Structure 1
Amino acid sequence: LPVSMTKTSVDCTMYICGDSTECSNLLLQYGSFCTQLKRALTGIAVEQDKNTQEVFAQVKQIYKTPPIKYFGGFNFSQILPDPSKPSKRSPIEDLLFNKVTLADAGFIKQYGDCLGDIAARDLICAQKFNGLTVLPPLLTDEMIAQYTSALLAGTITSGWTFGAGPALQIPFPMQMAYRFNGIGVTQNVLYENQKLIANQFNSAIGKIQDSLFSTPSALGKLQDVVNHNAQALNTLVKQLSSKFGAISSVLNDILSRLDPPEAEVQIDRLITGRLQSLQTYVTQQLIRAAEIRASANLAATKMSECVLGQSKRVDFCGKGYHLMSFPQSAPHGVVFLH
């Protein structure tokens, strides 16, 4: 489930009129046509930050797993964070990070090595060149995993009690037995086949890692989201080379060929072409942001129901009768282990 995407704060003047006083003056004749774009993109970034906050910061207290890990024979080392790893992320989130490649990280401050890029500069340097920039998310990828770890500790050490009020510690076999009771089967079937349940749980937890590793793309939603933002930015920066039915696509060239009294028509042509292109980009970003807000609200509901409790609704928390759901942090998204 995607939760957000790359926040953008597209600027008017540098993008449309590259450091040109006369072009900026002519753009000023359009009024607050692009201040709307700046406000819309700022609102989009704020909405994505709120999306992350709603989908992750559902618990006010950062819980910690006990130093020992023996939850009635259930093996949780695959989803609990690994202390040896510097990022303090579980193998599942490590595979998630390694399987997702971001075209633009944003939190790189790439300026400084664009001159040192030596080779053909990439999308990041090009977009910094032509008026495009990317803001980083408020919640870092480390603390997002920290929220995930706190949620996991709560949901494996206190059942669903911590989702309602104070965290009440309870043995994991007892908690699983009570999930069985909530799914219409008495705790005796679990307490007689605890070994079998633990072995099946361990086998499934081991096999989902291999499925993620060997599958072509099980991160399709997040990868499609990232590719959509990257392609939108690429088209945005490609529209700068379009003639838009004028003499040339170079603002300096059109001035160095027609004196502005006869060049203002082509200046206005470039202005309206780039304004309409940016309008299309911003509208598409608004549409994708609404879709992402819907997806993240669905993810937050899935968290608040399947994670901090057991949901009686079927299919909602995976196929079959629902027992649990362990979240894992993902790049610009979340992953549920139903």
Structure 2
Amino acid sequence: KFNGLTVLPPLLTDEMIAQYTSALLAGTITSGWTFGAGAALQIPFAMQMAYRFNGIGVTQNVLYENQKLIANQFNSAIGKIQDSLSSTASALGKLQDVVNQNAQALNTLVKQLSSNFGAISSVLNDILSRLDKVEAEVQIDRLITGRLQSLQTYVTQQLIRAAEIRASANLAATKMSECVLGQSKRVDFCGKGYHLMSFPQSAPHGVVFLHVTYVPAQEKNFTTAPAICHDGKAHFP
């Protein structure tokens, strides 16, 4: 378990990440996107949402005339996230998978110490206690070659996995810059619906975004026209 394998701590502790997710969130609540652009500028939270609705082509008065409904929907929806996360761990599959793959890689790297690779024993001290150096070196070359090939394989796996996790980190960094610090217009980049804002929350080895999105609900059919004739001239909306 400890045969030259070691785990180093992160530079940032989880308590430091929790301060950064607090800072990002407190900026996002008190000051909208402005703390992303430069100095944080305070703005009342209803007026921030009024800008964010206007950012999806919904007129500001559609917020203010519905503010208690919108607050009740938002507060209720946050409550449903706690229930969803409480109900099953299987929601965090993307994080638990990254922990499990590393544990399987190290357990495979450790179990490979027990393999003979065609030597008389995989316990190196057997060879050294049982054989003269001229004989022992022919056996130990097999264990060295086998163990070295196993270690090169483990490092090759970890390089490829580290590139996959870098692509995920660059995606998360892009998500935070646009989707928390701004209001990304990029359809379905910030969850389903028209994007409003998102709140980051820290997680072991990762990040969780709560994307908040306007989704249209009840709807009606109408007869429609591209334009209307008045005094022979055509009017457009």
TM-score of the aligned structures, taking structure 2 as reference length: 0.87
Name the CA distance, whole Å, in 1 between partners of 2:29 and 2:89.
31
Q: Secondary structure at the match of 2:117?
A: coil
Equivalent-residue separation in structure 1 for 2:15 and 2:97 (angstroms): 23
CA separation in 2, counterparts of 1:284 and 1:265?
Answer: 29
Three-state SS of the structure 2 residue aligned to 1:325 is: strand
**Shift of residue 215 of structure 1?**
2.4
Offset at 1:129? Answer: 3.1
Query: SS where residue 12 of structure 2 aligns?
Result: coil
Q: What number of residue pairs does the alignment pair up?
A: 210
Spell out, residue by residue over 1:220-272, the C-alpha distance to the aligned partner (whole angstroms, 9 max, x if none): 01100000111111111111001111100011101222211011111111001
Partner of 2:105: 232
Q: Which residue of 2 aligns with 1:188?
A: 61
Cα displacement (A) at 1:273: 0.5
Per-residue CA distance 1:259-302 (angstroms, 9 max, x = gap): 11011111111001000110010010000100000000000000
Structure 2: tracts of 5 or more residues without a match:
211-237
| Identical-pair percentage | 96
Structure-to-structure mapping, 1:255-294, within 5 angstroms:
255-294=128-167
After superposition, what is the alpha-carbon deviation per residue over 1:180-201, rounded to whole angstroms, capped at 9, x for unaligned?
A: 0001111000000000000000
Task: Compute the TM-score of the two structures, normalised by the length of structure 1.
Answer: 0.61
CA–CA separation in structure 1 for the residues paired with 2:44 and 2:202: 26
State the 4+ residue runs in structure 1 displaced beyond 6 angstroms: none
2: CA distance, partners of 1:277 / 1:156: 51
CA RMSD of aligned residues (A): 0.8
Query: Is the alpha carbon distance of 1:167 and 1:216 closer, same or farther for their aligned partners in structure 2, counting shifts above 3 Å?
Result: closer
Q: Which has the higher contact order (CA 8 A, sep 6+)?
A: 1
Q: Deviation per CA, 1:98-156, whole angstroms, max 9, x where unpaired?
A: xxxxxxxxxxxxxxxxxxxxxxxxxxxxxx53111000000000010000000000000
- More strand by percentage: 2
Q: What secondary structure sits across from 2:195 in the alignment?
A: coil
Question: Unpaired segments of 5 or more residues in structure 1?
Answer: 1-127
Tell me the residue number matched to 1:243: 116
1:169 equivalent in alignment to 2:70: no
Is 1:152 the counterpart of 2:46 in the alignment? no
Structure 1: how far apart are the matches of 2:56 and 2:21?
A: 25
